[PDB]
Amino acid sequence: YATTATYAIIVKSAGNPYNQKESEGYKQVIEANGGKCVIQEPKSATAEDQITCINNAISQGVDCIAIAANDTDALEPALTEAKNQGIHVLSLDSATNANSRKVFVNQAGTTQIAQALMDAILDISGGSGDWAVLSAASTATNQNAWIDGMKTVMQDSKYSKLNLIGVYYGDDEYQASCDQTEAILAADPNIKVICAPTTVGIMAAAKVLQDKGLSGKVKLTGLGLPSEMADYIGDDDQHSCPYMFLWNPIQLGNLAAYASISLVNGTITGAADQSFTVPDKTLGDNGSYKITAAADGGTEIILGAPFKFEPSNIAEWAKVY
């Protein structure tokens, strides 16, 4: 994994601790192995602000770009231009389309996240009732994939007494996510569960439910940082979130860095059925990963399974991320 190349990571947006942990993990591995890492945080979680960052990376003459896409398709011209300049493009966290990358590094199976969330809603609701999604940007590939996944999973007869009222967008912004939580509550006060598959959205919704005194009546699940959600997690009337899920964003960054170095050094090309082993034997199968065909027609590397954070384990993990 020795490298002397320069690697740009472009996260979704500024002002999001999840993205900072991702970029930290990426930088740590790149630098440990001799490369240079340049991190960019788009001003907002939009395609427009990301394109500006892609263009900056190209201008700096970097060797590799790793990107968490704010839109599945809008980045394609800039990323193609990067490729035309000889830059390896990798995607992580939120996928660019298959034509815009050599490989996607996915935190967990898309289906695994959808299934965990649907089963959580079914459990936490008591088996029936109205629920809503508080998403991030309406264009974000990952939330859209999870939401599509949930909608597929929820067709199963076991979920037939649940009713999804709709999808609201908090844009991965605290204030917007608080405002949309209030909008959800106003639209359906009898809602049983809010599912927020965004670390920003879930902690914003938690804050709103706590402030309104609703933790005993409206429950909350989703995808959140243990560090942010620790005080909201509990199985009683005083905590809105009985449990939620995530994965290690630092390790997501780590793996994306190992894969980036592997692309630059030519150890992999992104093609299905290729394998690589990273120094870190806690990832994969004793460090080993295989590239698999992805549903979007590209290829992907899957970091691990989702991890459930609940009262029995939340405090220890809150110090990790």
Ligand X SMILES: C[C@@H]1O[C@@H](O)[C@H](O)[C@H](O)[C@H]1O
- The CB-nearest residue to ligand X is 18
State which amino acid sits at residue 314: I
Minimum CB–partner distance for residue 55 and ligand X (Å): 21
> CB-wise, 5 or 101, nearer to ligand X?
101
Minimum CB–partner distance for residue 159 and ligand X (Å): 22
State which amino acid sits at residue 216: G
> CB-wise, 63 or 228, nearer to ligand X?
228
Minimum CB–partner distance for residue 121 and ligand X (Å): 16
Minimum CB–partner distance for residue 199 and ligand X (Å): 4
Residues 6+ apart with CB under 8 A from 284: 277, 278
Q: Which residues bind ligand X (CB under 6 A)?
A: 12, 16, 18, 68, 93-94, 136, 140, 142, 172, 197-200, 223
Minimum CB–partner distance for residue 123 and ligand X (Å): 20
3-state SS assignment for residue 91: strand
CA–CA dist 14, 24 (Å, integer): 13
State which amino acid sits at residue 139: T
> CB-wise, 16 or 100, nearer to ligand X?
16
> CB-wise, 177 or 240, nearer to ligand X?
177
Residue among 229, 231, 243, 252 at smallest CA distance from 308: 243
Residue among 49, 47, 53 at smallest CA distance from 75: 47
> CB-wise, 33 or 115, nearer to ligand X?
115
CA angle (287, 40, 296) in 5-degree steps: 55
SS in 3 state form for 212-263? CCCCCCCEEEEECCHHHHHHHECCCCCCCECCEEECCHHHHHHHHHHHHHHH
Minimum CB–partner distance for residue 214 and ligand X (Å): 23
Minimum CB–partner distance for residue 178 and ligand X (Å): 15
> CB-wise, 7 or 247, nearer to ligand X?
247
Residue 238, burial from CB neighbour count under 10 angstroms (0-12, 13-18, 19+): exposed
Minimum CB–partner distance for residue 164 and ligand X (Å): 19
CA–CA dist 174, 1 (Å, integer): 38
> CB-wise, 12 or 35, nearer to ligand X?
12
CA–CA dist 115, 112 (Å, integer): 5
> CB-wise, 17 or 234, nearer to ligand X?
17
3-state SS assignment for residue 124: helix
